[PDB]
Amino acid sequence: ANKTVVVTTILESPYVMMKKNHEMLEGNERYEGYCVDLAAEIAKHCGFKYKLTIVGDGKYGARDADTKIWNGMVGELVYGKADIAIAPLTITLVREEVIDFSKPFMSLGISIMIKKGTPIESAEDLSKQTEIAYGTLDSGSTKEFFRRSKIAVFDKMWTYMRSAEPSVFVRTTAEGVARVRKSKGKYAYLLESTMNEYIEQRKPCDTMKVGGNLDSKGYGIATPKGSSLGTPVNLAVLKLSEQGVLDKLKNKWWYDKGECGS
Numbered sequence: 001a002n003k004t005v006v007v008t009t010i011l012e013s014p015y016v017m018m019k020k021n022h023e024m025l026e027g028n029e030r031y032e033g034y035c036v037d038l039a040a041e042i043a044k045h046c047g048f049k050y051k052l053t054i055v056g057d058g059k060y061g062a063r064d065a066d067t068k069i070w071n072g073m074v075g076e077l078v079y080g081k082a083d084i085a086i087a088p089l090t091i092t093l094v095r096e097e098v099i100d101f102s103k104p105f106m107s108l109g110i111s112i113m114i115k116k117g118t119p120i121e122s123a124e125d126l127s128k129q130t131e132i133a134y135g136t137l138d139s140g141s142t143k144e145f146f147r148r149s150k151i152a153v154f155d156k157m158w159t160y161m162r163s164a165e166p167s168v169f170v171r172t173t174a175e176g177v178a179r180v181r182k183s184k185g186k187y188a189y190l191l192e193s194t195m196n197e198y199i200e201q202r203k204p205c206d207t208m209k210v211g212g213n214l215d216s217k218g219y220g221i222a223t224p225k226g227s228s229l230g231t232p233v234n235l236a237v238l239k240l241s242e243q244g245v246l247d248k249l250k251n252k253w254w255y256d257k258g259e260c261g262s
């Protein structure tokens with residue numbers, strides 16, 4: 001018999017956010033955003049009931065080198081705590097080895113956020129100077145990209161970042177953004193282009209994304225390996241793409257009510 005599907009996700013604007021009047025509400029109704037709408041669409045097209053839950057440890061999914069335990073949403077999937085993850089979860093080799101990803105539902109790449117006026121146009125620009133500090137989230141796919149890169153510029157950047165004092169790493173998107181905004185052009189933040197483009201359209205309208213992306217990848221919906229949900233979820237993602245629903249949802253949550261003009 002069908003059993004209610006436990007969705008693991010995480011608060012990250014505009015993917016999942018607490019409604020302002022969330023306290024008056026209950027269950028799935030508490031939340032709003034791109035991934036909330038997407039979960040509704042997937043569930044509709046797969047014929048399942050579901051429960052949105054916020055990941056306990058606030059993490060996306062990494063493996064501890066010593067203990068080999070997976071944390072975050074990937075962890076919830078691997079250890080049987082959740083049946084599906086619907087979040088801006090980057091498709092990576094290390095994650096795909098232990099869970100299944102759908103086809104991607106959104107494209108992104110690592111990108112550069114600056115406070116307007118910062119004299120930086122590219123990663124190379126960043127790598128060749130020291131006056132403007134720059135960094136990434138303290139863990140996640142961006143940091144791993146830098147840690148593992150053999151590309152000259154990116155190698156030089158990682159070498160700088162891992163040793164910079166005080167730390168150039170941040171714990172949350174909100175923190176990286178606040179640091180850009182409050183550092184008077186002396187901090188640039190390396191983050192996924194999706195969040196970058198989102199932030200650029202929000203007041204106080206004092207940041208921007210500069211240069212091309214450093215890589216090209218996607219977010220995927222994740223299921224435990226061998227789940228019966230894998231195939232229908234994947235097909236649902238293809239369908240939503242082809243029906244224009246993914247485009248409509250990204251417009252809805254990024255641009256339709258952009259706050260920095262046209």
Ligand SMILES: CC(C)S(=O)(=O)NC[C@H](C)c1ccc(-c2ccc([C@@H](C)CNS(=O)(=O)C(C)C)cc2)cc1
Nearest residue numbers: 091092103104105106107108216217218237238241
């Ligand atoms: C991690 C990498 C292997 S990757 O991200 O999967 N691909 C790398 C390559 C550069 C790339 C990167 C991103 C995309 C890409 C293209 C489209 C989309 C959305 C809009 C729809 N995805 S879909 O699979 O094409 C669709 C028909 C459902 C999402 C991601 C396609 C290819």
Ligand SMILES: C=C(C)[C@H]1CN[C@H](C(=O)O)[C@H]1CC(=O)O
Nearest residue numbers: 060088089090140141142191192
């Ligand atoms: C917001 C976080 C911590 C997530 C979102 N996608 C990446 C991931 O799935 O690891 C992380 C961002 C990043 O690494 O820039």
